[model samples]
Target: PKDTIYHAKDAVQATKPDMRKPRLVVFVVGETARADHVSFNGYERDTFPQLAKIDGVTNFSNVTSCGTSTAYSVPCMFSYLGADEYDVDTAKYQENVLDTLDRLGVSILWRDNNSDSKGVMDKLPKAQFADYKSATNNAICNTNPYNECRDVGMLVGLDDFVAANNGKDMLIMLHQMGNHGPAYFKRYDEKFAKFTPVCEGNELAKCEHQSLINAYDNALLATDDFIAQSIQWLQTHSNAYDVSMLYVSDHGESLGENGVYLHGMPNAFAPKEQRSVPAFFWTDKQTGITPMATDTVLTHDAITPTLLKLFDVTADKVKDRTAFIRLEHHH
Candidate 1:
């Protein structure tokens, strides 16, 4: 594809002179996952037991999302424009983090199990995007009206994708059908139903509050398993590439909090339950990367800068933002 105004031919460049080793960064986008409920964030339940035990995992408990809804957040989270300056009309014509990386010669793939990429992956070549929601052979997919597959389904053809883009710096974004509301009970398999007495239906308001929480936590447990699997996959390829993974939820959800059963509240007045999100960063031990701090205030704005820093790419748009992680070498 030809470059456009948003992705100018010479707008971005990688400062890392050596690309021979190749780098693989997996960015996982979670749906409707809140910070307070995550076990790493001090939730009483052990929803993130698997990820918590991983050595290199850094959990950011103070992160805020770009928007309350997927339609508004997904695009803005990827855009160079910060949440304060984000406008859907203006963002439509602007290049996102992926486009900037693409210009810097990074091979990109977006595997989505959620509704869609919400225009974030629009500029990429059609071949780079995979919609797992429409997958037919996925036994884990829900057969209901939504026909959405489980998050693990996004990993089905990833090995092939990595092989095809061999020896190139790559970025693979996994958009998860994470703890998406009301039907949270259906998001995970029966084995992950660790929290019992869960709400079993789509009508959240009618269910007991504890039961609703159980269902949402169960869904998060499923996500935890998915992330663990992704990290293991990346570790298998670590011998060939410097591998890292970053996971962030698009937005949070309100589970009968203040009588609010779901998300999409106006930004100005949205509760913390609807805006505060969970973020995790993990890198293979060989990469020698460490977080600047385990807990710090963050927003969607940090993502683009962090991605650029991870790949050693620089662009005018990432001028003042700081990357939360850094490389620390040992003799």
Candidate 2:
């Protein structure tokens, strides 16, 4: 028993990296963006004009985020599993796959235009928190452009940070505070604020339903301009990596649909407008590729796996994740 010798290790594994195809993904998360207000889904206003200008933006106009608030929806929507696998009642939880991605060296950031609650923004190493509570009185959100600009401002900051860092294999979640309100009127500009006769005040549920909708519609157009600028920002930083952008809301809002004002309404009682969201996928021209839409509805659960596939993460522990790349987009 003087010595124990074991020569069973003889595998020379190659650690070659496909660095030429450095991938960058953007997950644009919206708060309380009603599908009816966003023009891409056929709302009268130009909610996503910048994104609409792209070649292969698959607008999945019929999506419903799992829950009605950031509390339940954020954790549920952002997981390796789908809404079906989310059950918060049992006091159990799984490791969010994005957390796994972060450990594997994928830089993930959450740029928030609202409060960082319920752990959505917690995924990122840092979040550029946007507090608009006192920014322009919250009453003119649909009429004052400045009032709706906190989210874009966060983008401005995120871009500079990403640029300084030489971003690669990164996942940036830009969370927008869209049409969030007891006051939708505070979300846009007066030029877009012409909705016949607005509800007189920001009392959403008590206001004339159509008029409140008009206010919400205007905010959508403003968001489009913001996205346009975002595209330009992406181009400035474009390198060898293929860049892809996605848009999805945590949940929708109720513009007095059934006497509901702001979000935070209970699920069973909320209208479909407050649950259905507008989801879109956009790719940069630098990619020289077009994305075709698939028949199946995509969800937020696509995050980690998409990055895994993009980076060709071959770890056997997670080799079976699903990621619909350009092929599915082309189909």
Candidate 3:
């Protein structure tokens, strides 16, 4: 057996003229969110209504995720490795896109409200938004799962965090606790109850099918609000830096399709509902990143190069597999 590990090496900056403005790049990683349910991707419901209203946002609907679960997908998305070449040991040791950017002098931070980064962020400044008690006086933690939290809790200190990094070209990865639920009712506040008769607990099988859909759809509504809020924050601080965000779900979810609930299903048996993910881009820059055809296919492989391009740098090391998408003459 031969090794597929991406050997550690120093990354160099692109020699081209650095005409870019000071940048603030955020990659928002979605948890357990599927594409088919998002209104931006033409879902029948208004799951992504707020995000849909944002001008200059490209709703890239053709995304295919890297892995079926966060443990695999999160690490994989940050790496140049595909799901086929990915193994636990290799990924842990491999220099990822974040590592490359860090080496190239971009300030990097990771904000997590879900699980740890699976060693993907071993060397970066990272924070967890969870609490020991779900209800401290100032707590924004979860409602019923004891110590977990709603996705909105991750936003608490972001203003200060971004404000502090005012001078450098920055990269912030926001890993959301989005739509991770059997208790979907807990993902949103009551004001976001766009649907009715939702399933209110962890027991999925106990509720009517419509009840489950209502809960999940309402959760999606909450996620839309979160994304909208984050973007608004970026827009408000436009004078600080040229801001942009890349949003993609780690993988899709199964909403009782063929009796499958949640995610982490095996590839061979996983339905399209589990494979298709929603992705989008929002930038304030002219000639910003563009979206492909709705039917165009994209894997996590594109993320590294696209982000390298985003960072206004290039990967010059070996074992680099960032295949930059050519959107030449794109309309």
Tell me, by lDDT, which candidate is best: 1
Candidate 1, position 173, lDDT: 92
Give the runs in model 3 whose Cα sits over 4 Å from its true position: 1-10, 15-19, 125-139, 142-148, 286-288, 316-331
The per-model lDDT (C-alpha) reads: 0.83, 0.59, 0.72
What TM-score would candidate 1 get against the native? Answer: 0.93
lDDT by residue for model 2 (187-240), tens: 655655655565547555566777776777666766666566665566655665
Cα lDDT tens digits for candidate 1, 108-148:
89888887788877887898887777766355576444566
Q: How accurate is candidate 3 locally (lDDT)?
A: 0.72
Report clash pairs, candidate 3.
Answer: none
Worst 10 residues of 3 by lDDT: 129-138
Candidate 3 lDDT score at position 253: 86
The residue ranges of model 1 lying beyond 4 angstroms of the native Cα positions read 1-12, 15-20, 137-139, 142-148, 327-331
RMSD of 3: 3.9
Flag regions of model 2 displaced more than 4 Å: 1-18, 88-93, 121-149, 189-196, 286-295, 302-304, 314-331
Better of 1 and 3 by TM-score: 1
Each model's number of backbone clashes?
A: 0, 13, 0
How accurate locally is residue 40 in candidate 3, as Cα lDDT from 0 to 100? 71
True-structure lDDT of candidate 1: 0.83
